[PDB]
Design an enzyme around this catalytic site. Structure first.
Site, PDB file in Angstrom:
ATOM      1  N   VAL A   1       0.654  -0.968  -0.073  1.00  0.00           N
ATOM      2  CA  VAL A   1      -0.114   0.055   0.080  1.00  0.00           C
ATOM      3  C   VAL A   1       0.700   1.244  -0.059  1.00  0.00           C
ATOM      4  CG1 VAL A   1      -0.313  -0.381   2.395  1.00  0.00           C
ATOM      5  CG2 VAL A   1      -1.896   1.343   1.207  1.00  0.00           C
ATOM      6  N   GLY A   2       2.066   1.135  -0.509  1.00  0.00           N
ATOM      7  CA  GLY A   2       3.001   2.133  -0.535  1.00  0.00           C
ATOM      8  C   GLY A   2       4.537   1.988   0.092  1.00  0.00           C
ATOM      9  N   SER A   3       5.205   2.967   0.539  1.00  0.00           N
ATOM     10  CA  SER A   3       4.659   4.419   1.071  1.00  0.00           C
ATOM     11  C   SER A   3       5.396   5.530   0.828  1.00  0.00           C
ATOM     12  CB  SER A   3       4.068   4.177   2.761  1.00  0.00           C
ATOM     13  OG  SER A   3       2.827   4.756   2.759  1.00  0.00           O
ATOM     14  N   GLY A   4       6.625   5.670   1.189  1.00  0.00           N
ATOM     15  CA  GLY A   4       7.561   6.872   1.231  1.00  0.00           C
ATOM     16  C   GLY A   4       8.922   6.735   1.572  1.00  0.00           C
TER      17      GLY A   4
ATOM     18  N   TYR B   1      10.347   6.481   4.911  1.00  0.00           N
ATOM     19  CA  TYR B   1      10.770   5.885   6.135  1.00  0.00           C
ATOM     20  C   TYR B   1      10.837   4.324   6.004  1.00  0.00           C
ATOM     21  CZ  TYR B   1       5.636   6.861   5.495  1.00  0.00           C
ATOM     22  OH  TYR B   1       4.454   7.103   4.917  1.00  0.00           O
TER      23      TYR B   1
ATOM     24  N   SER C   1       8.524   1.159   3.285  1.00  0.00           N
ATOM     25  CA  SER C   1       7.390   0.301   2.587  1.00  0.00           C
ATOM     26  C   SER C   1       6.375  -0.312   3.624  1.00  0.00           C
ATOM     27  CB  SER C   1       7.626  -0.596   1.655  1.00  0.00           C
ATOM     28  OG  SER C   1       9.006  -0.749   1.271  1.00  0.00           O
TER      29      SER C   1
ATOM     30  N   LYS D   1       5.121  -2.463   8.150  1.00  0.00           N
ATOM     31  CA  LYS D   1       6.016  -1.565   7.867  1.00  0.00           C
ATOM     32  C   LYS D   1       7.426  -2.062   7.764  1.00  0.00           C
ATOM     33  CE  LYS D   1       6.345   3.240   8.484  1.00  0.00           C
ATOM     34  NZ  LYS D   1       6.719   4.111   9.935  1.00  0.00           N
TER      35      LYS D   1
ATOM     36  N   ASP E   1       0.663   8.366  13.252  1.00  0.00           N
ATOM     37  CA  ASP E   1       1.786   9.290  12.690  1.00  0.00           C
ATOM     38  C   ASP E   1       2.440  10.443  13.313  1.00  0.00           C
ATOM     39  OD1 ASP E   1       0.664   8.674   9.318  1.00  0.00           O
ATOM     40  OD2 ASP E   1       1.712   7.371  10.628  1.00  0.00           O
TER      41      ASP E   1
END
Lengths: 338, 11
Positions: free
Chosen positions: A27-30, A32, A34, A50, A165
């Site tokens: 689902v991602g992410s960025g 920091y 996946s 994560k 978050d």
């Protein structure tokens, strides 16, 4: 009690997880790391897994990884995301490289809720009550969230809410003292964010959608008035003070005219949160006692946090020291009950 | 505050 792991490559990253976690789907992410959604066969729930990217790449990152693991292990509250699990495939500190974090998995955030229905005043009361209750807990551990906004708020079918978050892209919910770096800032930057979120729940409009920092400051000062001398003395930067004093003076607006039609107890609480001087802003604990929340407030069911030791922020350590402390924290993780 | 939808067709 090391579980059985199984390894599988998906989206060109290797995932090596205990077999309790099934049906992993990206689902991602960025920056920091996946994340995959998965089904946790031990608890029967869907979870987010994560994988940290390069947790031990530099001193800055190893320390960051340790900070996040320490924070997540500590947070134990109905309205704050907690750590369901943490694991490494490594069998020893030697061989330790990857870190995986497991949490509950958010269906919708607050934007999705607003997108699929019109909220009543009672929904806004319960939603905001729950933010403040989460915040009372966070703040009692001397933690500042710093990045409250609708997309960091998970909300379920029952309108139950959790704060996600922590810091550590949208500036609209940010207190002005931090947006323009006026000063050493306090916990009440989060209360400013709650005021912004609540105002938008009541009206359907973003309260301060400035296109850059200056524009947003002008929207803010227009509502709350330019700073008086008492606040001006507390701005550390002479340039910041100087720029502020170059503004035409502006009085505080009448919030009843800005929020016409809203519950007058709502508007009253907004005036307590949207105060420019952060020393005069209402605190989370005080906000919970506000007549706006009389149907939800229960002072015996608004817990504070165990003491949270952050003296590690001052340590000057080698990468391998941060990484070995992180490993200790993975090793001592105890999952939530039943 | 009761029974919300989580997901819906739009955007």
């Amino acid at each position: 009690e090391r579980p059985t792991f199984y390894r599988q490559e998906l989206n060109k990253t290797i995932w090596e997880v205990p077999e309790r976690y099934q049906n992993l789907a990206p689902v991602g992410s960025g920056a920091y790391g996946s994340v995959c959604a998965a089904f946790d066969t031990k608890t029967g729930h869907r979870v987010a897994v994560k994988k940290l990217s390069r947790p031990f790449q530099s001193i800055i990152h190893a320390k960051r990884t340790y900070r996040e693991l320490r924070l997540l292990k500590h947070m134990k509250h109905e309205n704050v995301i907690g750590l369901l699990d943490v694991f490494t495939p490594a069998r020893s500190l030697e061989e330790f490289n990857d870190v995986y974090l497991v949490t509950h998995l958010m269906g919708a955030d607050l934007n999705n809720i607003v997108k699929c229905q019109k909220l009543t005043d009672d929904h806004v009361q319960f939603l905001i009550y729950q933010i403040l209750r989460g915040l009372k807990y966070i703040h009692s551990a001397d933690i500042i969230h710093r990045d409250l906004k609708p997309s960091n708020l998970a909300v379920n079918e029952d309108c139950e809410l959790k704060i996600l978050d922590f810091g550590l892209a949208t500036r609209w919910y940010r207190a002005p003292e931090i947006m323009l770096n006026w000063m050493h800032y306090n916990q009440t930057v989060d209360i400013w964010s709650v005021g912004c979120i609540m105002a938008e729940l009541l009206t359907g409009r973003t309260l301060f959608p400035g296109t850059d920092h200056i524009d947003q400051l002008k929207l803010i000062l227009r509502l709350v008035g330019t700073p008086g001398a008492e606040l001006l003395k507390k701005i550390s930067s002479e340039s910041a003070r100087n720029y502020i004093q170059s503004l035409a003076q502006m009085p505080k607006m009448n919030f009843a005219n800005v929020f016409i039609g809203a519950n007058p107890l709502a508007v009253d609480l907004l005036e307590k949160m949207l105060v420019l001087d952060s020393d005069k802003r209402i605190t989370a604990a005080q906000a919970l006692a506000h007549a706006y929340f009389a149907q939800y407030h229960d002072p015996d069911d608004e817990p504070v946090a165990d003491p949270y030791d952050q003296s590690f922020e001052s340590r000057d350590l080698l990468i391998d020291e941060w990484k070995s402390l992180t490993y200790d924290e993975v090793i001592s993780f105890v999952p939530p009950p039943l | 505050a009761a029974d919300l939808r989580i997901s819906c067709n739009s955007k």
